[PDB]
């Protein structure tokens, strides 16, 4: 049932343009947020938005607006890789490659070796979407802090010596770099 395309950090005018182009070339449905059907995420400015992260997590193409301008002139969807934001988001190309090379439904394994995490319901981004991010990267999330060996986000409970209390940036940077970052920098107070 069709694939979706989503715009992020996109100026109004460029949005209009994209709507036109997609209207002309077909093949895509415009969506407001990255979901299971999304395969392309177009960005006006290379900023790390939720859509960008989610798009990386699902192995989508994370591209610059230009891709839509050349596609319109050539009369069809062209090579995405030339417009892929690999420099700002090294994980984009990697995850995409994994997703395509994947035999059957793809699912990330970035947080496979990680222990169960508790994500603060006061976290930024919103705990739901941040948990989504965790699960799309093969992570595990408990609703109970007591089971977690890693707690992410604002937390004023008793601090166990064995537990790791980290910021959301640990997750975010890990997804961006596609390498699990060193917790030492992301230690909360």
């Amino acid at each position: 049932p069709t694939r979706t395309l989503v715009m992020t950090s996109m100026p109004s005018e460029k949005q209009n343009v994209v709507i036109q182009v997609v209207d002309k070339l077909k093949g895509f449905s415009i969506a407001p947020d990255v979901c299971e059907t999304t395969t392309h995420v177009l960005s006006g400015k290379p900023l790390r938005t939720l859509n960008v992260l989610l798009g990386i997590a699902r192995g989508c193409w994370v591209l610059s607006y230009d891709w839509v301008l050349w596609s319109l002139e050539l009369g069809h969807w062209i090579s995405e890789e030339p417009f892929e934001l690999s420099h700002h988001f090294p994980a984009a190309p990697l995850c995409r490659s994994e997703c395509h090379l994947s035999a059957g439904p793809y699912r990330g394994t970035l947080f496979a070796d990680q222990p169960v995490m508790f994500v603060s319901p006061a976290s930024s981004p919103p705990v739901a979407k941040l948990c989504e991010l965790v699960h799309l990267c093969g992570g595990r999330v408990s609703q109970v802090p007591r089971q977690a060996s890693i707690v992410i986000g604002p937390y004023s409970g008793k601090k166990k010596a064995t537990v790791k209390y980290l910021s959301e940036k640990w997750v975010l940077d890990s997804i961006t770099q596609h390498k699990v970052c060193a917790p030492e920098n992301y230690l909360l107070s």
């Binding site: 790390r48 938005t49 939720l50 992260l53 981004p125």
Partner: peptide
């Protein structure tokens, strides 16, 4: 409002 950057 523009999408937040994290």
């Amino acid at each position: 409002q523009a999408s937040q950057e994290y």
